[PDB]
Design a protein around this ligand. Structure first.
Ligand SMILES: O=c1ccn([C@H]2C[C@H](O)[C@@H](COP(=O)(O)O)O2)c(=O)[nH]1
Ligand SMILES: O=c1ccn([C@H]2C[C@H](O)[C@@H](COP(=O)(O)O)O2)c(=O)[nH]1
Ligand SMILES: O=c1ccn([C@H]2C[C@H](O)[C@@H](COP(=O)(O)O)O2)c(=O)[nH]1
Ligand code: NA
Ligand code: NA
Ligand code: NA
Lengths: 128, 128, 129
């Protein structure tokens, strides 16, 4: 299976091949400064068409907090197969626990794909 | 595959069907006000019997922080198949980074199911 | 059926027990750790593991971690790859404290499961989607 990837512009660093099954590091599309106790969407400079029936999960890298002092406000970001449009660029939602600077090209988070949950039948009951 | 769902009461909004594999939005069962730097378990007004051998994963929605100023203290909630009792209602563990008000019926987080990890044995060794 | 090889820091580490029905598995603080409000500490878990080939592990807080200890996990979910299998590749829990707190040696502070790694994928650059 394959992922089609469109970059925001030619200066974005092309990301790792995916022949191995490791999570894949994504990078700041531009410089982003965030003050202590403030929030910014860090653009990742990439848009993707994921395989039919899959979704992507995005979390911080292990070293992100140590080096940048940010947490990811939504814990883990879900990118559905449907977020496949020409302007559907990815972002990393960052809350700074201290004044910080992220520079263009800095690796800031990581992703993998996973099969979406199967079709399920929700049936209401009065008791369990 | 089916999930049996019990709602806290008649006023809880019945949630989305699960035909497409998308994550499913869960909603506040009552008004909850949270002060900056305080914590509250936000009731979701649902109890579920998940399919055998499955667990649920719960994370904020992408827009939760922007709209509500809360993060999920456990990052991703994991609800086991065994949490299927008639009083086993679900909660979103919220920490407010600013004063906030959540209203009854607001979408606050999302879940999916996933198969539990395969059978595995833990074997102590004296060296790797 | 599959196997996880687990090695402990020392004999004082309380050995981990697997939940027979496939539940996530709790891990324990390897030593006492004091963390001041708004400070960070990489809490040692006192375990190194060789995971099954083609698998990874996922680490999240327990539901009770915040109530008990007032900490959040700064990386959201830890990813432990199959390759992190060396004799000195000990696991940690990266804790940010939202209040002054003390964690005691042996406290169950986080939980893990394994999951198959994503399959091989071909990344293909395109000009438009
Ligand atoms: O951490 C995230 C979470 C989401 N998205 C993308 C995928 C979503 O489809 C879109 C937001 O749409 P809603 O989920 O808010 O509809 O943003 C990200 O780039 N990063
Ligand atoms: O984000 C979560 C995580 C867990 N639970 C369920 C399953 C737990 O067994 C139960 C109670 O958790 P503790 O009181 O053991 O933390 O809540 C949730 O509703 N939300
Ligand atoms: O919450 C975590 C996340 C990672 N690790 C381990 C596995 C990683 O291989 C290593 C850090 O390596 P990088 O991911 O920074 O390469 O730490 C942990 O013990 N706990
Ligand atoms: Na990369
Ligand atoms: Na609605
Ligand atoms: Na102990």
């Amino acid at each position: 299976m394959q992922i089609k990837i469109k970059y925001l512009d030619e200066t974005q660093t092309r990301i790792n091949k995916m022949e191995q099954g490791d999570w894949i590091d994504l990078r700041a599309a531009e410089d982003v400064a965030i003050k202590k106790d403030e929030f910014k969407l860090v653009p990742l400079g990439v848009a993707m068409e994921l395989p039919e029936g899959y979704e992507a999960h995005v979390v911080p890298r292990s070293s992100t907090y140590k080096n940048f002092g940010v947490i990811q406000t939504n814990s883990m970001g879900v990118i559905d197969e449907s977020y496949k449009g020409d302007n559907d660029f990815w972002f990393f939602p960052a809350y700074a626990l201290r004044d910080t600077k992220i520079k263009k090209g800095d690796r800031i988070c990581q992703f993998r794909i996973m099969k979406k949950m199967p079709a399920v039948d929700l049936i209401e009951v009065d008791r369990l």
